[PDB]
Design a protein around this ligand. Sequence first.
Ligand SMILES: CC(C)(O)Cn1ncc(Nc2ncc3cc(Cl)c(C4CCN(C5COC5)CC4)cc3n2)c1Cl
Length: 261
Amino acid sequence: PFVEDWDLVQTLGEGAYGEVQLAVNRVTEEAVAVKIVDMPENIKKEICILKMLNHENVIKFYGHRREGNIQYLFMELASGGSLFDRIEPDIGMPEPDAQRFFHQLMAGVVYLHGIGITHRDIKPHNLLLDERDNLKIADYSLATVFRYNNRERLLNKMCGTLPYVAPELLKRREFHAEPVDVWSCGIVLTAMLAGELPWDQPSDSCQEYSDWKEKKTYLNPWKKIDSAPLALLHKILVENPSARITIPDIKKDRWYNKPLK
Ligand SMILES: CC(C)(O)Cn1ncc(Nc2ncc3cc(Cl)c(C4CCN(C5COC5)CC4)cc3n2)c1Cl
């Protein structure tokens, strides 16, 4: 397949809406990524969000091309693949690599929150790496505006991936966008350190979640995590979104600031 001067050489994944392909410009040899979307209101929103994005830990938007009922979303290519592929099942990854990616994830989330944007699907599959292993937050199809004209809007729609969602998202009619993103960053952190997800959803029915609230840290995935990153997770994975730690205080955490090998 092809679009204009770009050849679509290889699939890079597929979401709820479309497929992402590796686009090699036949002339310049430049390699980008193209989200191919079939058929209207959400894509106009997504482009609007993407156009604003200007940060080193956020996937750069290049432009869009419409070819009838098909939309092509040209984005920055992260040659290093995803963070998912760097996590070893049941092991995770080395602590210094986990801390580095967590720092870059915080920088990107701080950025998005700064411009009133919530990602709503922070998980390893949406965290891509460049050639120098710099983390990039990708896929903005679930992203939305939580702040406009310095007025905050509570979210009501239930969006995301169940093992990453904050518990208020399942139990509340309305909730603040930012503690939802902080929570998923905490699950990403857990995955990086234990190569395991803590539960299937943060609901009282799920025993693994109830075990966490009871402080049963002698259980997986918690027993694989060192006491210092575990202290941070104790503050991130808090049920009440008002009691939950914010990025300014995450930036003050001992493990966050711990010099690592
Ligand atoms: C195979 C390999 C060796 O790892 C090479 N490899 N993999 C991916 C890429 N580069 C890359 N760059 C930019 C992209 C932009 C975007 Cl927006 C995406 C989306 C794909 C669909 N996922 C959803 C499915 O579950 C979540 C969300 C992200 C993929 C990209 N992939 C390279 Cl190079």
